[PDB]
């Protein structure tokens, strides 16, 4: 009667910009992970600290679904211990991550004639994100010594950049929709179980 709304997460019309990655909480529901795992839709379903074929047998206190768009060659950065613009400045997983990273090619949705430029990432940041940190700030980045005082100029940069998703892009520059499932085990009754 009370099914986890993984449908709503995976079948959303729009996904978040990775710099402003969307988090949903899933609790107190029956989860069918087999329907996800066996789906023809996904080209990545990579897990850490849990076997995906065992998920229907497990109970968790909560499941968090983090979702966003990146380019194909950045899907590798969505894993523990990775570096690069996305891992360092946008979305960081911890070394001790217990979860699954699910990705599918979204060229048919997130690319269009004359290119789609609705999806943003953080290009500049003074320090690397902590695990599960979100920075949605739009302050001018100081790359030099002369004060920016809130204005773009010499060594003074707007910190966000748009992806250019043209349909004819190579697969590494095509948009991928990513869902990161975090399987949380608190010292509390489990609320999210497989069938």
């Amino acid at each position, epitope marked *: 009667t009370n099914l986890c709304p993984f449908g709503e997460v995976f079948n959303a019309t729009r996904f978040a910009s990775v710099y402003a990655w969307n988090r949903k909480r899933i609790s107190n529901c029956v989860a069918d992970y087999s329907v996800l795992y066996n789906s023809a839709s996904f080209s990545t379903f990579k897990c850490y600290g849990v076997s995906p074929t065992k998920l229907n047998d497990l109970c968790f206190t909560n499941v968090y679904a983090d979702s966003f768009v990146i380019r194909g060659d950045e*899907v*590798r950065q969505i894993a523990p211990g990775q570096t690069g613009k996305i891992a360092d400045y946008n979305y960081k997983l911890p070394d001790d991550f217990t979860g699954c990273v699910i990705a599918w090619n979204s060229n048919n949705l997130d690319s269009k004639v004359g290119g789609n430029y609705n999806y943003l990432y953080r290009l500049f940041r003074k320090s690397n994100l902590k695990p599960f940190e979100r920075d949605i700030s739009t302050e001018i980045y100081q790359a030099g010594s002369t004060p920016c005082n809130g204005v773009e100029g010499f060594n003074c940069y707007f910190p966000l950049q748009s992806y250019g998703f043209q349909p004819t892009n190579g697969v*590494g520059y095509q948009p991928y929709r990513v869902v990161v499932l975090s399987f949380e085990l608190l010292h509390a009754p489990a609320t999210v179980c497989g069938p």
Partner: antibody
Framework: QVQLVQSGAEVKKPGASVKVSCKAS????????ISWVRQAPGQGLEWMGW????????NYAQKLQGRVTMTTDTSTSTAYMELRSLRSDDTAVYYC?????????????????????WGQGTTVIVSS | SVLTQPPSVSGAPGQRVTISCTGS?????????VHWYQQLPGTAPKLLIY???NRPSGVPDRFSGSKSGTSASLAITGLQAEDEADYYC?????????????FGGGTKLTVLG
């Protein structure tokens, strides 16, 4: 015991096709992908493409513009490379190789990783 | 070949030699790892270095890899006759054209006997 065994030598006419096989043993085939690399006689290594074994998702070299098809048979742990419209510069030893990358589940993006296990190679000569 | 290596290098037994691998902004310069292969005549390439600097179990510490900017280097210290081989550098090229595994042209190493 970890090995890739490839099909035997082929001689093909220009315009014809060839289908090379690559049978895995000593490991779980579907926990890794297969990359294909060819080497013209006396020349360098050239990557052709990869297939992720679980879902059969493929990525082909731009140079082999829709001439190459890579497949796997999960039930025989066998990867296949079909190259169509053969020309003289397709004459080479064809290798299958395993990018040294496994995860719990599956992943298409296997191109970043050093290839640890190689087949013995298959000689393909294009001749009339 | 997308990566550039010298066609040949030679050294006497016991000596040190280096083999250069130069790429571009879209492969080594884009943060993609360099792997190295050793090919004996009539054999499949053997993985020698992975992830810029790592040796597989069977590879002696005489072989070391480095990566910096748009280039990489294989150093062999105390050359032995058995190191005589073709050496290939390998990386990954991400561009609007496609995502491809790329190789150097190969370096023939002679151990002067």
């Amino acid at each position: 015991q970890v090995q890739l065994v490839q099909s035997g030598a082929e001689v093909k006419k220009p315009g014809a096709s060839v289908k090379v096989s690559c049978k895995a043993s000593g490991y779980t085939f579907t926990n890794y992908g297969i990359s294909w690399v060819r080497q013209a006689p006396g020349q360098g290594l050239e990557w052709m493409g990869w297939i992720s074994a679980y879902k059969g998702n493929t990525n082909y070299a731009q140079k082999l513009q829709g001439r190459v098809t890579m497949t796997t048979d999960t039930s025989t742990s066998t990867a296949y490379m079909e190259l169509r419209s053969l020309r003289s510069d397709d004459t080479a030893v064809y290798y299958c190789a395993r990018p040294d990358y496994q995860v719990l589940g599956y992943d298409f993006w296997i191109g970043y990783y050093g290839m640890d296990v190689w087949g013995q190679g298959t000689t393909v000569i294009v001749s009339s | 070949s997308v990566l550039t290596q010298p066609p040949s290098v030679s050294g006497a037994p016991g000596q040190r030699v280096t083999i250069s691998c130069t790429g571009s902004s879209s492969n080594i310069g884009a943060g993609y790892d360099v792997h190295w292969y050793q090919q004996l005549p009539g054999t499949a390439p053997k993985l020698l270095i992975y992830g810029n600097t790592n040796r597989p179990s069977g590879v002696p510490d005489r072989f070391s890899g480095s990566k910096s900017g748009t280039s990489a280097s294989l150093a062999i210290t105390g050359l032995q006759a058995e190191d005589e081989a073709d050496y290939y550098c390998q990386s990954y090229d991400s561009s609007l054209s496609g995502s491809e595994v790329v190789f150097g042209g190969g370096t023939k190493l002679t151990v002067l006997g």
